[PDB]
Amino acid sequence: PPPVRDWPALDLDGPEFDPVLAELMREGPLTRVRLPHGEGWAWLATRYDDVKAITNDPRFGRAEVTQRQITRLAPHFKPRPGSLAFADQPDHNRLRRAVAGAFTVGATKRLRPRAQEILDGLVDGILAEGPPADLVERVLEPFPIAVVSEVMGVPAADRERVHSWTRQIISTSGGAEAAERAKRGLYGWITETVRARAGSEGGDVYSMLGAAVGRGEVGETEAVGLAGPLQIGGEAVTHNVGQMLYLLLTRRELMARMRERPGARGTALDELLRWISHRTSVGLARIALEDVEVHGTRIAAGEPVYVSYLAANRDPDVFPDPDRIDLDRDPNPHLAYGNGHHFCTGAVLARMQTELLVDTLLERLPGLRLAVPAEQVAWRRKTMIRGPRTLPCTWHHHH
Ligand code: HEM
16 A cells, blocks of 8 residues: 655646656656545545546445544634535436536526627727736636626626625635524525525526425425525636636747637637636545456555546646647546536636636737736645636737
8 A cells, every 4th residue: 555645735837747647647647645634545546537437436425424534724614504515416407407508508608798798898898098007906816707707797886795705615724613504694694685586496506406306305404505605606707717828928928829729729628628727726525335356456445536637638648748738639638627527617708718817818908918926826725626816818919
């Protein structure tokens, strides 16, 4: 059995691959890791084939994780009922069916025009005020929240209440207790919002959810846990695109390639998704439910195991010269959105936003460049999702 390896919290103000994770990928297909918080250790799968398998093995469950204190990145661990993340079948399917209809390909295309308008409105503002602008604050953070709220069904006077609260995603750390305070507000709002609508119609997430509760399909108590993650989910788009833009802004050649292929950025965006280190650590582990062996290692029942989609996305057997951003790849089967039944609920929605963002920013901010040296951009620390805290930019305004 392999020796327990410590995996400290990453402190790197850049998009570079975590050297600690690299050192693990080369130690073997499976390694035991100990994260900053929680108890003990857990197995870690680095091979694409192994990740894709475990991620799809009925023998590994998520529900059990809620019953323990598996080594994790954060010190705070309080699972909620209704969580898609911690849902095993048949509950997972039950829960998702109540909201899935709002995130389908069709719903997303229907939504695109409204999203473009919301995005153009945000871009109008910075163009009107003039050059100096922090794109994270003025575009990457508010755009997703506005679109998701649209999908969720937030009224109008509630928009600012929900946005402000959601800001509990923090810009790194503006408190902690203030984070639990804000959720005590947002979650109470979700519960009440859902209580009402309990019988109403509309493809609306909160509407549909409230309707599903009135029929005892996804009973109350499960509302917050099921919907919270969705309402806050936009943060992933904010930081993943912040990273994409950072690369475009610090590696001029990438910006150039991007600018030369309007209407054909599909492979470029998927290559950035494959290469970008989206998270600072591993997400939620899965629990062995019946003593299994993987890629030559034996995992005893009850033992936890994390998969690394990042490491997987760099597997030399699936992606030749994995550390190079060559864009245009063959199909490119990266696992940026996960795999299995826990595949990202908002993948399609997140993609539509990403494409709008990149297309609209490149066309509407002529001569876009960082307004400060990249070295001056600090990154999010002590949190799951990685990315630039700010992105000070400037662009052509006038003679
Ligand atoms: C490009 C931006 C995004 C990326 C890279 C991303 C990535 C991921 C990943 C890697 C997982 C974990 C899958 C697993 O459990 O193995 C996940 C789960 C999830 N994501 Fe995202 N996500 C993004 C955007 C979003 C958005 C915008 C939403 C909300 C509409 C969202 C909602 C969720 C939910 C609800 C889950 C839990 C799914 C489940 O366990 O069934 N994600 N995402």
